[model samples]
Target chain A: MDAKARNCLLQHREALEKDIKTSYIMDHMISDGFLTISEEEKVRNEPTQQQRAAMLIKMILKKDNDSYVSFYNALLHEGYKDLAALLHDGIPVV
Target chain B: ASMDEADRRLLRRCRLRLVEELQVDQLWDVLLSRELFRPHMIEDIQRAGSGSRRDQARQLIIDLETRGSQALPLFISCLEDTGQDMLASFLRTNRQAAKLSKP
Candidate 1:
C-alpha cells in the first residue's frame, strides 16, 4: 500500500546514497560512536527500503544507485523525526 | 541557583525531545537494518528476551560509561518509568553505577 507513495521518494537513488553517508557522519558526531553494522542492518530492513525499493526497481537495473536515502527517510518518518529534522537543518557540532 | 519552574519544565521538554529523537534514530538504524530482526535473527532476540533485564542493565552501564554526567536524571527517569519491571531495575542499578562512578 505505501509502496507507491514511498517510491516517489526513492526514485533518485544516487541522491539517497549521499544522504546516508552525510547523515551517518552527522549522527556519529552527535552520538560519539561510529555507525555500527547493526545500524546499517536497521537501514536495510526499513519498510521504505524493503517494500518501496523492492517495488521501485523490480527489474533490477544494473546501474541503480542503491537508494540509501529512501531507507534513511523511512527511518525518519517512522520515529526518528528529530534526527531527520537535525539533518534537514544542519550538521551538528560535537 | 535561580532556575524557575517554567525553566525546569522547558528543560524537561527539551530533554525528552532529545532522548526521544536520539533513541528513535538509533532504533531505526538497528531495527530497520534487520540487525535486531529477521526470521533467523528473531530467534536470537527471543532468546535475549529471556534475559532482557540483564541485557537492559548492561546497556545502562554502557550508557553511563559512554555518556557520563551529561546523561542526567531526565534520562534516568525515563528508564525508571519505562513500565518494564526488569528495565526499571536496570535503571536503578545503573543509577547506582552513575553515583559510584562519580567522584
Candidate 2:
C-alpha cells in the first residue's frame, strides 16, 4: 500500500509541489511553527520530484484542511483512484 | 483594511511589555500548549519546540504585526478556549478597538 501510494504521489509530483506552495494553510503552518523554517526552505528551494512528493504526502498526512481535499482531488484528476481513495480514508471528519 | 494607528501603537506597546516581563520561550510554551491549529499534534509541538525560542518569538511578533487584523480574532478565541481569559480579553479588546478605529 505504501509503495503504491508513493508511486501514485510521484506521478503527480508537479501538481503536489504547486499545491503546497500556493496553500494558505501552508503559510499558516509556517507561521505557527507546525512547519519548520528549514523544511519550508527545502520545499521552496530546488527539490527533486520525489522529495516534493514526499513533502506533500507528509503535509497531507499532517493537516486536515481544504488543501488536503484539493490534493486528493488532484490525485483523482490525474487518474490515481486507488491513491485518492487511500487519502480520502485518512481524512478526518472536521 | 489596515489597523488604526492608535490600536497598532497600543498592541506594539503591549507586545514589548510582555516580552520584557516574560521569557519569550515561556510565552511560546503557553501558546503551543493551547494547540491553536486543530491539526497540530504532540509531535508537531515537539518539532516546533526544537527551534530557538527567541527566533520563534521574533517570527511570531512579525506575524502579529503584519497579520493581526485578520489573525488576532481567531487567536484570541483559541486563547479563550484554552482558559487564558485574561490574555484573550486583552487581545480581543485590542482587536475590536483596532477595527472600530479603522473608519
Candidate 3:
C-alpha cells in the first residue's frame, strides 16, 4: 500500500530535504497519530535541525499508507506548499 | 589536536570516577539545558534499563570525547551548576587550557 507513495517521496528526496523544518511537521504528524511522542523524540535527537529533519524524511519512508497521507497533510498545513504539491500530485492511482 | 586529545584522554581516564560518584539523571538534564549533548543522546543514555545510573554516567563521559573542544568545559560548568562542585573543580584543574595553536 505504501510502496507507490514511498516512491513519490524518494523522487523529491533532495528538494524535500533542503528547506523543510521537521519541528512543526512532527507536531501535525503526532497529533494525527502517524508518529508517537517517542518516535518524534527519536528523530528530534539528531544534533542539528537539518539532521533531525533528514531523519524524519528517512523514517517516513518506512511507514504505512496513512503515515504517508498524514505527512502530506502536515506539509500542507505547515505551509510547505511546494513540497505538499509534490506529495499531492504523486498520490498513487492504484 | 593535542589539546582536544588531552581533554578526551582525561575524561576517558576518569571514567570510573564519573560513573561511581556522579548522579547521572541530574547531570543528564543539566547537560541537555546546556545543549552539551544532543537531547536524544542524553535521552538514550537515560532510557537504558539495567545499570541505568552507571551506564548513563559512563556513556556520558565517553560521548564527551566527540562533543567538540568546549565539551569538557561546558560539561564541567554543568557539574558545578548541579552542585557537583568537587568533581567539577577537579576536572577544571586537570584539563589543559587550549593554546593558540592548531594542527
Say which candidate scores most in lDDT: 3
The lDDT of model 3 is: 0.73
For each prediction, how big is the interface RMSD? 12.4, 14.8, 14.7
TM-score versus the correct structure, for each prediction: 0.26, 0.34, 0.48
On the 0 to 100 scale, the lDDT of residue A6 in model 1 is 36
DockQ of 1: 0.03
Off by over 4 Å in 2: A1-43, A46-94, B1-70
Give the better candidate number (1 or 3) by lDDT: 3
- Please list the C-alpha lDDT of all candidates, in the order they appear: 0.35, 0.47, 0.73
Candidates, ranked, lDDT: 3, 2, 1
lDDT of 1 by residue, B1-103 (tens): 1122332333344443333333221232333243222233223333443445444333333222212122334344544343334544554565456556655
Worst 10 residues of 3 chain B by lDDT: B94-103
Tens digits of per-residue lDDT, candidate 2, A1-92, equal 24334454455444344322223334555544456677666655544544654564665555445445555665454333434554555443
RMSD of each: 15.9, 12.3, 11.2
Ranking by TM-score: 3, 2, 1
Error of 2 at B45 (Å): 6.1
